[PDB]
Design an enzyme around this catalytic site. Structure first.
Site, PDB file in Angstrom:
ATOM      1  N   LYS B 125     140.620  49.066  76.990  1.00 45.69           N
ATOM      2  CA  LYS B 125     140.516  48.070  75.929  1.00 45.69           C
ATOM      3  C   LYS B 125     141.583  48.317  74.881  1.00 45.69           C
ATOM      4  CE  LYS B 125     138.491  44.913  73.162  1.00 45.69           C
ATOM      5  NZ  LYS B 125     137.192  45.338  72.570  1.00 45.69           N
ATOM      6  N   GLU B 178     130.698  41.649  59.759  1.00 52.21           N
ATOM      7  CA  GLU B 178     130.316  42.780  60.587  1.00 52.21           C
ATOM      8  C   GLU B 178     129.904  44.063  59.863  1.00 52.21           C
ATOM      9  OE1 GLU B 178     133.261  43.629  63.474  1.00 52.21           O
ATOM     10  OE2 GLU B 178     131.978  44.987  64.575  1.00 52.21           O
TER      11      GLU B 178
END
Lengths: 374, 373
Positions: B125, B178
């Site tokens: 990733k 978030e």
């Protein structure tokens, strides 16, 4: 080893400090702690040092410099590591652009203002000072500068401290002070107020004559006695008993004769740290005046520059509370190609403008000699 | 309501404005600043300093501030001189020059290099990001920018953090959706977001995108990886964790996000929110897997320093409670210039153009607040 420590000084060292009891080189900033109120700073520092111990630093110290003005924010550093040797043993081994801030006449005007304020009874004592900005055509070699100072300062304290910058190039406070604000070793406290000055002479007969004159000057003796009384009154609550010599002594640097008294005491409380004591003393009348807050307001109003770290205090203190703090004089802020040098003179009713200016010049010699501009 | 007054009293000098779903904090001045070289031993210093602040005065003092993306940098937080804390908020012409740093090609150049390195099995990733410098004809009214962000961010975390200066005042401002982590007593919550689509003004298309995100195998899979890393970080601190089987979708005005609330119950009452934040920071949502490897790739590919963007910011108290958010949908503001930021998670099966569009959609939170939506 002590000379190794001088050789190893880099602009990432957080403190070099060469005193008559030791030499310290501290590398890195592991922790920095800043605080709004000088009076509650010692407890915060001890908490930070205890944390450092318990997080695995075997000898945690704080090092750094505090400003002249007690109302400003204060800050110290716990270095990553520090090396500590015996005292330094050494045998002696471009365009510059000068800008006096302020000019000689404005400084003298300010001296007349101080006199006046005393002649009206607003103040007893005032120290007025001035600065000198120096732009080099090359980058100043701090490590060489430091070595020049060390080699010509057998008896005082030679230092370099990394200072707060914006993220500008690094800013270093460097110099050679004859004056101990306070030290603590075990329960022993010593402070060494200096007040009263004459410049050295290369003629050994004249040189001695000036030591004698200083040592017999009624104006200087009395003024020295008053500074000593204030140091003793600030230390007395912390000690069992204080030894205050009846007579001052004459000490010297290369540049100046000074009257000097060593005030000694034994603490009552083993947890009273050297930092706490430094803060109890700072600033002494020798660099500020009486009454301090009034001399300070007079100083702040008359001086057209900020002293910043000049006539503040600098040094180190450890987890046990031992440490050394010096009055920050005969010094310069150094940043890249520029320096700011500082000098001040005790002023009283009797004072004479030109003489005071002359005295600041004589005091500038310690730094100017280190730069080859004396 | 006091909350709204705290938003009105915000000043450029204020150390923290922080409006969250549980509270609104306005913090003034700097009683103590603490700066430290090793993020891993920062929590204990911070507790030492909070204890000292109590012993000097108020019963449950706080620290506030922002830490950088790069964990190896020095970290710093402030115990403010005083803070007002209230309930959650219940709220009821200048020309601009814009400059992409990098430009749209250089960025897609970067993403290609990224895909390349995951296909060689070095990384799994990688998140890649860009910025957008803005120059205003006037001085940016920070208070009004903050109010605009807050009004258009009912569900997120709106913040202004006074940053270490250059000389002129520097403020990190934003509206992040978030939560990195909160602590309340023994209860821990983290809310990783990974997987996104822009909102649409056409409410049928809007819902279609939500539904597509919620059922995209590629996005579900990458979300489960982020969720695994959150759990991994939290396991050693909790006797019990609750990890939802599947993510939900949440929205800001700008974006849909795949979201999982991970809850835990701590083993040790002395574990502070700041300590958990550090254990979590940064998540693969903004960095990658492996973290050290993918951060290397990130530093090497990106032609600017993220600095505080994709860092963490928030507050923690002497008891150990607090809230730390992932610093996204934000800008550095100085005088009459803003630097806006946005990033996009990249994988092997990624498409360069879709990442450029995704980042521009992410810029809308900040752009909208400037009246450039």
């Amino acid at each position: 080893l002590s000379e190794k420590l001088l050789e190893d000084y880099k602009t990432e060292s957080s403190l070099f400090f060469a005193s008559p009891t030791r030499t310290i080189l501290a590398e890195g900033e592991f922790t920095t702690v800043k605080h709004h109120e000088i009076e509650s700073f010692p407890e915060l520092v001890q908490a930070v040092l205890r944390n450092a111990k318990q997080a695995g630093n075997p000898n945690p110290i704080v090092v750094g410099a505090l400003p002249f003005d007690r109302r400003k924010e204060v800050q110290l550093i716990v270095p990553e590591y520090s090396r500590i040797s015996e005292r330094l043993q050494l045998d002696p081994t471009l365009t510059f652009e000068m800008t006096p801030v302020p000019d000689h006449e404005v400084y003298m005007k300010g001296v007349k203002q101080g006199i006046e304020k005393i002649k009206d009874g607003d103040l007893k004592k005032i120290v007025l000072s001035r600065s000198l900005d120096v732009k080099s055509s090359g980058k100043i070699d701090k490590q060489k500068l430091l070595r020049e100072l060390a080699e010509h300062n057998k008896h005082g304290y030679t230092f370099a401290v990394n200072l707060p910058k914006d993220e500008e190039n690094s800013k270093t406070l460097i110099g050679a002070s004859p004056e101990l604000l306070v030290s603590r070793h075990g329960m022993q406290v010593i402070s060494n107020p200096l007040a009263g000055s004459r410049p050295r002479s290369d003629d050994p007969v004249e040189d001695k004559r000036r030591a004698e004159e200083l040592l017999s000057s009624p104006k200087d003796l009395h003024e020295h006695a008053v500074v000593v009384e204030a140091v003793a009154a600030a230390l007395r609550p912390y000690c069992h008993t204080l030894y205050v010599p009846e007579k001052p002594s004459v000490i010297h640097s290369e540049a100046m004769w000074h009257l000097s008294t060593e005030v000694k005491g034994e603490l009552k409380n083993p947890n009273t740290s050297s930092l706490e004591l430094a803060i109890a003393l700072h600033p002494t009348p020798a660099v500020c005046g009486t009454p301090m807050e009034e001399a300070r307001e007079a100083i702040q109003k008359i001086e057209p520059f900020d002293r910043e770290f000049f006539t503040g205090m600098l040094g180190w203190s450890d987890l046990n509370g031992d440490g050394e703090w010096i009055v920050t004089i005969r010094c310069a802020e150094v940043q890249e190609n520029t320096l700011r040098l500082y000098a001040g003179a005790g002023v009283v009713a009797e004072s004479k403008p030109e003489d005071e200016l002359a005295e600041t010049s004589a005091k500038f010699q310690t730094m100017l000699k280190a730069l080859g501009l004396n």
